[PDB]
């Protein structure tokens, strides 16, 4: 009925770290994941359950924070922008399937200006 549960582990992917990565996971994930607008990111949209029978047609590739959480405590991303586009197609779905001015799209673009502030500190690669 939904689709499922996107994959946040790689079998045989060896473990590594970046300064990037590591910046992702305990500066950036981490402020989102505590600011009071995250609760609505922190899983997959349940589009069943939120009675939004639409949701799938508009949005081809869902993204979370609860996906992007996972995946950076199981180093599943083998670089730092593979990481920030899962951020990115999280901030555009939102954009594209809600009414601009609804409380999800504030939401979300409160916690893209404190993503983008903290991307501009990124560790060069
Ligand atoms: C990440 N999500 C969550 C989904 C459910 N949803 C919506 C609003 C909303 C507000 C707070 C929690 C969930 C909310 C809202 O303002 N208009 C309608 C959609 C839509 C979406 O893209």
Redesign the pocket.
């Known amino acids: 009925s939904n689709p499922p549960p996107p994959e946040t582990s790689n079998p045989n992917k060896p473990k590594r770290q970046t300064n990037q990565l590591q910046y992702l996971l305990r500066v950036v994930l981490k402020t989102l994941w505590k600011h009071q607008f995250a609760?609505?990111?922190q899983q997959p949209?349940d589009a069943v359950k939120?009675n939004?029978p639409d949701?799938y047609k508009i949005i081809k590739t869902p993204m979370?924070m609860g996906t992007i959480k996972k995946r950076l405590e199981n180093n599943y991303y083998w670089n730092a922008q593979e990481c920030i586009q899962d951020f990115n197609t999280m901030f555009t779905?939102?954009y594209i399937?809600?009414?601009p001015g609804?409380?999800?799209?504030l939401?979300?673009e409160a916690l893209e200006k404190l993503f983008l502030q903290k991307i501009n500190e990124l560790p060069t690669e």
Request: proline share 5%.
């Open positions: 609760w609505p990111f949209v939120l939004l949701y979370d779905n939102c399937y809600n009414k609804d409380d999800i799209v939401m979300a």
